[PDB]
Ligand binder design. Structure first.
Ligand SMILES: [Ca+2]
Ligand SMILES: [Ca+2]
Ligand SMILES: [Ca+2]
Length: 428
């Protein structure tokens, strides 16, 4: 097994995603923007397995792997393909409504094992795929809920199913020598606060210790999956900097969380885990699909330096931060921009920047009353209401873009915004 599966391999390019990008480019009048979109279509994105049907629907898992083989033959070098394993029972428990098809109280764990993990493992075990590097991102929005959201019944009731399900997934995937396993661990705006950070380190250490190969059962962790938090806040590098008598982390946007960005957070987690007994061979991934924050939205353009307004900590932070969301918890259909392109080993301790969430795919439908004919499990979430307030702090708007289709479906208005706001900007 390699120390870093992203070194010496090219990323899988999903033709089904690229087809959507190119279709929009062909319908885009501005020749420069259209050319930028065509360039975007050449980049590598992860394949999401978000329900049992996803295993065989369309080209299916085998189809993507066969396509990866073709790209590998064509390129004359290894291909690394990223798969998102995302179907735990009581999935996304902190939402009032789960889009997940499996329920803990109705044989969810057992079905997760037999009908989701098992057939995935059988396909990945096919000797035909031995030449690939297969990266599996394990269950976004699962374990972090057990740190912060146990007050929510759906989360508290799912605890042991999450633990046993993730252990089962990793234990089975570890039997396949070219599978590289990264556990999802949210983002800095979720687990950055001291109590959450320590709670997460404790929890993930317990979860991994109980796996068959203990601390050797995984290859590392991933942050920022499907979120927008920047890699770096270059103009807020010191969370303890005093402005008007107070440290900048005390700003309303941060609420005393000292982690303003994903590099600080991912590297701190990695060091903490190594301190708990994980081998230094672990590496972190960060999803940079939508965290560039170029262009302008939410009443601001990207800052080009620390704010000149040192009159209050809020004025300073709000004028200095690259993440210009109204509130850090605003996760749905944000007017952000594409971030750093997928790349291997950008920093010591970081295995790669990856595009896990595929840019252009919706985070959720923007209003209730509309049922997805292909998945009646997908349900409107008020965080996606362009006219609504955040459920985490009602003083702030959701920031969600209007006219969004159901989650996973192509959202051309956001895709155009994501390309225009790319940082670094897309070059045709
Ligand atoms: Ca490694
Ligand atoms: Ca089965
Ligand atoms: Ca920083």
């Amino acid at each position: 097994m390699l120390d870093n599966p992203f070194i010496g391999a090219i990323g899988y390019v999903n033709p089904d995603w690229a087809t959507n990008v190119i279709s929009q480019a062909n319908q885009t009048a501005d020749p420069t923007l259209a050319a930028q979109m065509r360039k975007v279509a050449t980049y590598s994105t992860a394949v999401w397995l978000d329900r049992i049907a996803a295993i065989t629907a369309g080209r299916g898992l085998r189809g993507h792997l066969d396509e990866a083989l073709r790209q590998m033959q064509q390129a004359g070098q290894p291909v690394v393909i990223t798969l998102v394993i995302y179907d735990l029972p009581n999935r996304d428990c902190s939402a009032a409504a789960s889009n997940g098809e499996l329920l803990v109280a109705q044989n969810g764990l057992a079905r997760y094992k037999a009908e989701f993990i098992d057939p995935i493992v059988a396909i990945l075990s096919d000797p035909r795929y031995a030449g690939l590097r297969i990266v599996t991102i394990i269950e976004p929005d699962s374990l972090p809920n057990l740190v912060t959201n146990l007050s929510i019944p759906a989360c508290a009731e799912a605890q042991n199913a999450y633990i046993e399900g993730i252990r089962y997934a990793v234990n089975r995937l570890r039997t396949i020598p070219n599978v590289y396993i990264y556990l999802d661990i949210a983002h800095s705006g979720w687990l950055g606060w001291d109590n959450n950070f320590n709670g997460a380190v404790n929890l993930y250490t317990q979860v991994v210790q109980g796996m068959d190969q203990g601390f050797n059962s995984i290859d590392g962790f991933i942050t920022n999956v499907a979120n927008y938090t920047p890699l770096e806040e270059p103009y807020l590098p010191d969370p303890n900097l005093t402005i008007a008598g107070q440290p900048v982390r005390s700003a309303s946007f941060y609420e005393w969380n000292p982690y303003f960005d994903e590099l600080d957070y991912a590297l701190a987690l990695r060091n903490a885990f190594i301190g708990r007994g994980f081998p230094s061979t672990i590496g972190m991934l960060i999803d940079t699909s939508r965290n560039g924050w170029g262009g302008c939205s939410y009443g601001r353009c990207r800052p080009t330096g620390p704010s000149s307004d040192t009159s209050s900590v809020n004025a300073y932070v709000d004028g200095s931060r690259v993440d210009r969301r109204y509130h850090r918890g605003n996760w749905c259909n944000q007017a952000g921009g594409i971030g750093e392109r997928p790349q291997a080993a950008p920093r010591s301790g970081i295995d790669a920047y990856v595009w896990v969430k595929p840019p252009g795919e919706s985070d959720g439908v923007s209003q209730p009353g509309i049922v997805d004919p292909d998945d009646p499990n997908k349900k409107f979430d008020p965080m996606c209401d362009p006219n609504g307030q955040s459920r985490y702090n009602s003083a702030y708007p959701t920031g969600a873009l209007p006219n969004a289709p159901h989650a996973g479906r192509w959202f051309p208005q956001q895709f155009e915004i994501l390309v225009r706001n790319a940082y670094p900007p897309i070059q045709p």
